[PDB]
Amino acid sequence: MRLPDPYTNPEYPGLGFESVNLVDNDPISAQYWGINISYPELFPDEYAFLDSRLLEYKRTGDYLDVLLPQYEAFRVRGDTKSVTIPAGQKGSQIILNTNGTLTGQPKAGDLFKLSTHPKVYKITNFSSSGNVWNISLYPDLFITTTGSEKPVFNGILFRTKLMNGDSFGSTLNNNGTYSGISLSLRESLE
């Protein structure tokens, strides 16, 4: 379940977020991101759409994949598939070999994800030596690299669970829209 937005569904611009907060949970357990999405007033058809998607989400027990457009930095561009990430890596640093196919560089604060695993990281520092990139991450890597991972800097989806199904919804207001819709999502560690 991709959480529908104006990219997937440009016919519903209200599905653009009014506000989003990315929240750090550092438990006893592993770190996980919390996401709080607030919508502007939704019109009947876009509200009806989102409603039905969340319902389908409810009955199938799936995850919800979410894009946060605020993090569409596009500070790094190029052929990520020709990047090499050496095997055996763990901890808070991730080294990769760009093979000269990347342009630009990421900065502290940007998101990062491995192609083969759903966990999303924050980039905390970055240095390079020619085509060698040294990306410092938070939290530590959830897996040891296999050698087949590719870096993801843009179009990162968080794999989440809805926390507030029981307070989701609104009723028609006096200008024929639905106010106060917000979603509270928790990154799911499988």
Side-chain angles (χ1 to χ4, degrees):
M1 288 280 311
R2 164 75 177 270
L3 182 67
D5 60 22
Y7 293 124
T8 59
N9 293 90
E11 68 275 22
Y12 308 130
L15 300 189
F17 308 148
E18 188 145 81
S19 293
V20 178
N21 296 309
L22 180 61
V23 176
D24 179 27
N25 299 271
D26 45 317
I28 183 181
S29 311
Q31 191 277 344
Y32 63 93
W33 296 113
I35 284 169
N36 215 80
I37 289 166
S38 296
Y39 289 90
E41 286 205 336
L42 299 177
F43 282 69
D45 289 30
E46 55 201 13
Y47 175 76
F49 188 68
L50 180 64
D51 190 47
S52 55
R53 283 298 192 247
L54 297 174
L55 194 175
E56 179 81 350
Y57 156 87
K58 285 301 179 178
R59 297 292 293 168
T60 57
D62 210 319
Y63 301 93
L64 272 165
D65 296 332
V66 187
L67 191 282
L68 305 189
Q70 191 184 28
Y71 288 96
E72 291 291 81
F74 289 107
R75 260 184 282 273
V76 176
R77 308 182 200 178
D79 189 20
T80 52
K81 260 45 195 179
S82 40
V83 181
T84 310
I85 291 182
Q89 296 195 68
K90 50 196 193 62
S92 64
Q93 315 302 305
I94 190 110
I95 308 293
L96 44 83
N97 171 18
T98 71
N99 286 307
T101 68
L102 292 200
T103 317
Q105 77 180 18
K107 34 170 295 191
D110 292 351
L111 301 183
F112 178 85
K113 187 180 169 296
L114 296 175
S115 59
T116 67
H117 198 267
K119 189 64 183 92
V120 181
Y121 309 84
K122 193 87 160 172
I123 299 188
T124 66
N125 187 45
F126 171 90
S127 64
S128 67
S129 182
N131 292 347
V132 178
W133 283 14
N134 190 332
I135 304 167
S136 298
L137 305 170
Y138 176 82
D140 283 19
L141 290 168
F142 270 43
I143 61 181
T144 300
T145 63
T146 64
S148 64
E149 294 84 3
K150 304 302 178 194
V152 185
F153 298 99
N154 314 294
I156 292 163
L157 302 180
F158 296 73
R159 170 184 67 125
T160 70
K161 291 287 188 179
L162 185 67
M163 299 198 287
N164 64 339
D166 288 354
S167 68
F168 175 78
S170 193
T171 51
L172 200 65
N173 58 28
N174 282 315
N175 78 323
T177 60
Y178 294 89
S179 301
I181 297 310
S182 72
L183 295 172
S184 283
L185 307 166
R186 184 180 45 88
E187 192 178 31
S188 172
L189 320 177
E190 161 60 39

PDB file of all heavy atoms in Angstrom, residues 150-174:
ATOM      1  N   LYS A 150      22.188  -1.056  -3.371  1.00  0.00           N
ATOM      2  CA  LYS A 150      22.433   0.203  -4.063  1.00  0.00           C
ATOM      3  C   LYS A 150      21.919   1.318  -3.163  1.00  0.00           C
ATOM      4  O   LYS A 150      20.972   1.109  -2.414  1.00  0.00           O
ATOM      5  CB  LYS A 150      21.706   0.242  -5.414  1.00  0.00           C
ATOM      6  CG  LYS A 150      22.048  -0.904  -6.352  1.00  0.00           C
ATOM      7  CD  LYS A 150      23.562  -0.939  -6.649  1.00  0.00           C
ATOM      8  CE  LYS A 150      23.914  -2.109  -7.539  1.00  0.00           C
ATOM      9  NZ  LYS A 150      25.378  -2.389  -7.586  1.00  0.00           N
ATOM     10  N   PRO A 151      22.539   2.507  -3.238  1.00  0.00           N
ATOM     11  CA  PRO A 151      22.151   3.632  -2.393  1.00  0.00           C
ATOM     12  C   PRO A 151      20.872   4.239  -2.941  1.00  0.00           C
ATOM     13  O   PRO A 151      20.641   4.168  -4.148  1.00  0.00           O
ATOM     14  CB  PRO A 151      23.305   4.615  -2.586  1.00  0.00           C
ATOM     15  CG  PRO A 151      23.802   4.323  -3.954  1.00  0.00           C
ATOM     16  CD  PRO A 151      23.631   2.863  -4.160  1.00  0.00           C
ATOM     17  N   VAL A 152      20.043   4.788  -2.059  1.00  0.00           N
ATOM     18  CA  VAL A 152      18.866   5.544  -2.485  1.00  0.00           C
ATOM     19  C   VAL A 152      18.866   6.882  -1.754  1.00  0.00           C
ATOM     20  O   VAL A 152      18.936   6.921  -0.529  1.00  0.00           O
ATOM     21  CB  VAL A 152      17.542   4.771  -2.230  1.00  0.00           C
ATOM     22  CG1 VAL A 152      16.329   5.547  -2.820  1.00  0.00           C
ATOM     23  CG2 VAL A 152      17.622   3.378  -2.825  1.00  0.00           C
ATOM     24  N   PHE A 153      18.810   7.969  -2.516  1.00  0.00           N
ATOM     25  CA  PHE A 153      18.868   9.326  -1.973  1.00  0.00           C
ATOM     26  C   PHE A 153      17.585  10.095  -2.217  1.00  0.00           C
ATOM     27  O   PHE A 153      17.293  11.051  -1.503  1.00  0.00           O
ATOM     28  CB  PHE A 153      19.998  10.113  -2.624  1.00  0.00           C
ATOM     29  CG  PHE A 153      21.354   9.521  -2.369  1.00  0.00           C
ATOM     30  CD1 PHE A 153      21.967   8.734  -3.322  1.00  0.00           C
ATOM     31  CD2 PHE A 153      22.008   9.757  -1.170  1.00  0.00           C
ATOM     32  CE1 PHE A 153      23.224   8.171  -3.065  1.00  0.00           C
ATOM     33  CE2 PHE A 153      23.253   9.211  -0.918  1.00  0.00           C
ATOM     34  CZ  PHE A 153      23.852   8.416  -1.863  1.00  0.00           C
ATOM     35  N   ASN A 154      16.849   9.689  -3.250  1.00  0.00           N
ATOM     36  CA  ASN A 154      15.596  10.345  -3.626  1.00  0.00           C
ATOM     37  C   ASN A 154      14.493   9.312  -3.819  1.00  0.00           C
ATOM     38  O   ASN A 154      14.756   8.163  -4.175  1.00  0.00           O
ATOM     39  CB  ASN A 154      15.781  11.172  -4.910  1.00  0.00           C
ATOM     40  CG  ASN A 154      17.038  12.031  -4.878  1.00  0.00           C
ATOM     41  OD1 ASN A 154      17.146  12.953  -4.075  1.00  0.00           O
ATOM     42  ND2 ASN A 154      17.992  11.729  -5.750  1.00  0.00           N
ATOM     43  N   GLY A 155      13.251   9.719  -3.586  1.00  0.00           N
ATOM     44  CA  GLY A 155      12.135   8.818  -3.775  1.00  0.00           C
ATOM     45  C   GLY A 155      12.102   7.744  -2.715  1.00  0.00           C
ATOM     46  O   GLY A 155      11.635   6.638  -2.954  1.00  0.00           O
ATOM     47  N   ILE A 156      12.598   8.082  -1.532  1.00  0.00           N
ATOM     48  CA  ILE A 156      12.664   7.127  -0.436  1.00  0.00           C
ATOM     49  C   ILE A 156      11.284   6.964   0.187  1.00  0.00           C
ATOM     50  O   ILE A 156      10.641   7.937   0.542  1.00  0.00           O
ATOM     51  CB  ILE A 156      13.656   7.577   0.638  1.00  0.00           C
ATOM     52  CG1 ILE A 156      15.082   7.516   0.070  1.00  0.00           C
ATOM     53  CG2 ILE A 156      13.514   6.721   1.889  1.00  0.00           C
ATOM     54  CD1 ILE A 156      16.107   8.299   0.867  1.00  0.00           C
ATOM     55  N   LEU A 157      10.831   5.723   0.287  1.00  0.00           N
ATOM     56  CA  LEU A 157       9.573   5.417   0.959  1.00  0.00           C
ATOM     57  C   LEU A 157       9.840   4.825   2.340  1.00  0.00           C
ATOM     58  O   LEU A 157      10.653   3.899   2.490  1.00  0.00           O
ATOM     59  CB  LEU A 157       8.757   4.436   0.121  1.00  0.00           C
ATOM     60  CG  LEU A 157       8.422   4.897  -1.298  1.00  0.00           C
ATOM     61  CD1 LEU A 157       7.616   3.823  -2.019  1.00  0.00           C
ATOM     62  CD2 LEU A 157       7.661   6.226  -1.259  1.00  0.00           C
ATOM     63  N   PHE A 158       9.191   5.383   3.355  1.00  0.00           N
ATOM     64  CA  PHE A 158       9.193   4.750   4.670  1.00  0.00           C
ATOM     65  C   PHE A 158       8.127   3.663   4.679  1.00  0.00           C
ATOM     66  O   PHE A 158       7.002   3.884   4.218  1.00  0.00           O
ATOM     67  CB  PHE A 158       8.852   5.759   5.764  1.00  0.00           C
ATOM     68  CG  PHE A 158       9.851   6.872   5.923  1.00  0.00           C
ATOM     69  CD1 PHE A 158       9.940   7.891   4.986  1.00  0.00           C
ATOM     70  CD2 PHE A 158      10.669   6.920   7.050  1.00  0.00           C
ATOM     71  CE1 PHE A 158      10.842   8.924   5.146  1.00  0.00           C
ATOM     72  CE2 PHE A 158      11.578   7.949   7.219  1.00  0.00           C
ATOM     73  CZ  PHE A 158      11.664   8.955   6.268  1.00  0.00           C
ATOM     74  N   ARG A 159       8.465   2.490   5.199  1.00  0.00           N
ATOM     75  CA  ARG A 159       7.486   1.421   5.351  1.00  0.00           C
ATOM     76  C   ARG A 159       6.892   1.467   6.753  1.00  0.00           C
ATOM     77  O   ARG A 159       7.570   1.188   7.743  1.00  0.00           O
ATOM     78  CB  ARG A 159       8.123   0.054   5.116  1.00  0.00           C
ATOM     79  CG  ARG A 159       7.204  -1.097   5.488  1.00  0.00           C
ATOM     80  CD  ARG A 159       7.908  -2.434   5.345  1.00  0.00           C
ATOM     81  NE  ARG A 159       8.980  -2.595   6.323  1.00  0.00           N
ATOM     82  CZ  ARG A 159       9.070  -3.618   7.169  1.00  0.00           C
ATOM     83  NH1 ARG A 159       8.149  -4.571   7.166  1.00  0.00           N
ATOM     84  NH2 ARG A 159      10.083  -3.688   8.023  1.00  0.00           N
ATOM     85  N   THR A 160       5.616   1.806   6.839  1.00  0.00           N
ATOM     86  CA  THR A 160       5.027   2.148   8.119  1.00  0.00           C
ATOM     87  C   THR A 160       3.718   1.433   8.465  1.00  0.00           C
ATOM     88  O   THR A 160       3.124   0.745   7.639  1.00  0.00           O
ATOM     89  CB  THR A 160       4.669   3.648   8.124  1.00  0.00           C
ATOM     90  OG1 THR A 160       3.571   3.851   7.233  1.00  0.00           O
ATOM     91  CG2 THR A 160       5.838   4.501   7.674  1.00  0.00           C
ATOM     92  N   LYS A 161       3.282   1.649   9.703  1.00  0.00           N
ATOM     93  CA  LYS A 161       1.973   1.211  10.187  1.00  0.00           C
ATOM     94  C   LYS A 161       1.222   2.437  10.657  1.00  0.00           C
ATOM     95  O   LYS A 161       1.817   3.364  11.207  1.00  0.00           O
ATOM     96  CB  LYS A 161       2.127   0.252  11.370  1.00  0.00           C
ATOM     97  CG  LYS A 161       2.716  -1.086  11.024  1.00  0.00           C
ATOM     98  CD  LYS A 161       1.717  -1.955  10.278  1.00  0.00           C
ATOM     99  CE  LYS A 161       2.246  -3.372  10.105  1.00  0.00           C
ATOM    100  NZ  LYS A 161       1.283  -4.259   9.391  1.00  0.00           N
ATOM    101  N   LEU A 162      -0.086   2.442  10.454  1.00  0.00           N
ATOM    102  CA  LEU A 162      -0.917   3.540  10.930  1.00  0.00           C
ATOM    103  C   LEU A 162      -1.130   3.408  12.447  1.00  0.00           C
ATOM    104  O   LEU A 162      -1.457   2.329  12.949  1.00  0.00           O
ATOM    105  CB  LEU A 162      -2.247   3.519  10.191  1.00  0.00           C
ATOM    106  CG  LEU A 162      -3.210   4.670  10.467  1.00  0.00           C
ATOM    107  CD1 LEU A 162      -2.610   5.942   9.932  1.00  0.00           C
ATOM    108  CD2 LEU A 162      -4.552   4.395   9.817  1.00  0.00           C
ATOM    109  N   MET A 163      -0.939   4.495  13.182  1.00  0.00           N
ATOM    110  CA  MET A 163      -1.134   4.451  14.630  1.00  0.00           C
ATOM    111  C   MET A 163      -2.503   4.985  15.053  1.00  0.00           C
ATOM    112  O   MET A 163      -2.987   4.663  16.144  1.00  0.00           O
ATOM    113  CB  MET A 163      -0.055   5.258  15.348  1.00  0.00           C
ATOM    114  CG  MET A 163       1.369   4.751  15.117  1.00  0.00           C
ATOM    115  SD  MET A 163       2.485   5.419  16.379  1.00  0.00           S
ATOM    116  CE  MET A 163       2.645   7.124  15.881  1.00  0.00           C
ATOM    117  N   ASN A 164      -3.128   5.792  14.204  1.00  0.00           N
ATOM    118  CA  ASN A 164      -4.342   6.494  14.638  1.00  0.00           C
ATOM    119  C   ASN A 164      -5.585   6.214  13.812  1.00  0.00           C
ATOM    120  O   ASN A 164      -6.414   7.118  13.619  1.00  0.00           O
ATOM    121  CB  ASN A 164      -4.127   8.015  14.733  1.00  0.00           C
ATOM    122  CG  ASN A 164      -3.811   8.639  13.388  1.00  0.00           C
ATOM    123  OD1 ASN A 164      -3.365   7.950  12.465  1.00  0.00           O
ATOM    124  ND2 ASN A 164      -4.047   9.941  13.260  1.00  0.00           N
ATOM    125  N   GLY A 165      -5.747   4.967  13.391  1.00  0.00           N
ATOM    126  CA  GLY A 165      -6.948   4.562  12.683  1.00  0.00           C
ATOM    127  C   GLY A 165      -8.210   4.915  13.461  1.00  0.00           C
ATOM    128  O   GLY A 165      -9.222   5.308  12.875  1.00  0.00           O
ATOM    129  N   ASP A 166      -8.134   4.812  14.787  1.00  0.00           N
ATOM    130  CA  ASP A 166      -9.306   4.989  15.644  1.00  0.00           C
ATOM    131  C   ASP A 166      -9.730   6.446  15.808  1.00  0.00           C
ATOM    132  O   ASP A 166     -10.773   6.725  16.369  1.00  0.00           O
ATOM    133  CB  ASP A 166      -9.055   4.389  17.020  1.00  0.00           C
ATOM    134  CG  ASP A 166      -9.045   2.879  17.011  1.00  0.00           C
ATOM    135  OD1 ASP A 166      -9.350   2.269  15.963  1.00  0.00           O
ATOM    136  OD2 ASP A 166      -8.748   2.297  18.073  1.00  0.00           O
ATOM    137  N   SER A 167      -8.901   7.376  15.361  1.00  0.00           N
ATOM    138  CA  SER A 167      -9.310   8.772  15.340  1.00  0.00           C
ATOM    139  C   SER A 167      -9.208   9.345  13.941  1.00  0.00           C
ATOM    140  O   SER A 167      -9.115  10.562  13.756  1.00  0.00           O
ATOM    141  CB  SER A 167      -8.499   9.625  16.315  1.00  0.00           C
ATOM    142  OG  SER A 167      -7.149   9.741  15.884  1.00  0.00           O
ATOM    143  N   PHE A 168      -9.262   8.472  12.954  1.00  0.00           N
ATOM    144  CA  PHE A 168      -9.256   8.960  11.592  1.00  0.00           C
ATOM    145  C   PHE A 168     -10.666   9.276  11.131  1.00  0.00           C
ATOM    146  O   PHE A 168     -11.595   8.523  11.368  1.00  0.00           O
ATOM    147  CB  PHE A 168      -8.623   7.970  10.627  1.00  0.00           C
ATOM    148  CG  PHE A 168      -8.706   8.410   9.202  1.00  0.00           C
ATOM    149  CD1 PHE A 168      -7.835   9.373   8.710  1.00  0.00           C
ATOM    150  CD2 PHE A 168      -9.669   7.889   8.359  1.00  0.00           C
ATOM    151  CE1 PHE A 168      -7.914   9.797   7.400  1.00  0.00           C
ATOM    152  CE2 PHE A 168      -9.753   8.308   7.040  1.00  0.00           C
ATOM    153  CZ  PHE A 168      -8.873   9.266   6.560  1.00  0.00           C
ATOM    154  N   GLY A 169     -10.805  10.392  10.445  1.00  0.00           N
ATOM    155  CA  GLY A 169     -12.061  10.707   9.818  1.00  0.00           C
ATOM    156  C   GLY A 169     -12.495  12.104  10.174  1.00  0.00           C
ATOM    157  O   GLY A 169     -11.927  12.754  11.053  1.00  0.00           O
ATOM    158  N   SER A 170     -13.518  12.566   9.477  1.00  0.00           N
ATOM    159  CA  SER A 170     -14.046  13.883   9.715  1.00  0.00           C
ATOM    160  C   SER A 170     -15.459  13.826   9.215  1.00  0.00           C
ATOM    161  O   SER A 170     -15.886  12.833   8.634  1.00  0.00           O
ATOM    162  CB  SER A 170     -13.257  14.918   8.905  1.00  0.00           C
ATOM    163  OG  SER A 170     -13.544  16.239   9.324  1.00  0.00           O
ATOM    164  N   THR A 171     -16.183  14.908   9.412  1.00  0.00           N
ATOM    165  CA  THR A 171     -17.509  14.986   8.861  1.00  0.00           C
ATOM    166  C   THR A 171     -17.525  16.240   8.015  1.00  0.00           C
ATOM    167  O   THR A 171     -16.664  17.106   8.181  1.00  0.00           O
ATOM    168  CB  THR A 171     -18.571  14.981   9.966  1.00  0.00           C
ATOM    169  OG1 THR A 171     -18.258  15.982  10.942  1.00  0.00           O
ATOM    170  CG2 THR A 171     -18.589  13.615  10.645  1.00  0.00           C
ATOM    171  N   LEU A 172     -18.455  16.302   7.071  1.00  0.00           N
ATOM    172  CA  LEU A 172     -18.545  17.426   6.157  1.00  0.00           C
ATOM    173  C   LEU A 172     -18.684  18.701   6.964  1.00  0.00           C
ATOM    174  O   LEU A 172     -19.427  18.736   7.939  1.00  0.00           O
ATOM    175  CB  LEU A 172     -19.755  17.258   5.245  1.00  0.00           C
ATOM    176  CG  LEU A 172     -19.753  18.057   3.946  1.00  0.00           C
ATOM    177  CD1 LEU A 172     -18.614  17.589   3.047  1.00  0.00           C
ATOM    178  CD2 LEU A 172     -21.105  17.924   3.256  1.00  0.00           C
ATOM    179  N   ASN A 173     -17.948  19.741   6.587  1.00  0.00           N
ATOM    180  CA  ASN A 173     -18.109  21.027   7.258  1.00  0.00           C
ATOM    181  C   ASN A 173     -19.012  21.948   6.456  1.00  0.00           C
ATOM    182  O   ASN A 173     -19.629  21.516   5.489  1.00  0.00           O
ATOM    183  CB  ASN A 173     -16.765  21.687   7.569  1.00  0.00           C
ATOM    184  CG  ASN A 173     -15.910  21.929   6.324  1.00  0.00           C
ATOM    185  OD1 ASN A 173     -16.411  22.100   5.213  1.00  0.00           O
ATOM    186  ND2 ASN A 173     -14.611  21.931   6.519  1.00  0.00           N
ATOM    187  N   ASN A 174     -19.083  23.214   6.846  1.00  0.00           N
ATOM    188  CA  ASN A 174     -20.001  24.144   6.202  1.00  0.00           C
ATOM    189  C   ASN A 174     -19.522  24.730   4.864  1.00  0.00           C
ATOM    190  O   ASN A 174     -20.260  25.456   4.216  1.00  0.00           O
ATOM    191  CB  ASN A 174     -20.431  25.242   7.182  1.00  0.00           C
ATOM    192  CG  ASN A 174     -21.490  24.764   8.172  1.00  0.00           C
ATOM    193  OD1 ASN A 174     -22.457  24.099   7.797  1.00  0.00           O
ATOM    194  ND2 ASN A 174     -21.307  25.104   9.441  1.00  0.00           N
TER     195      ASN A 174
END
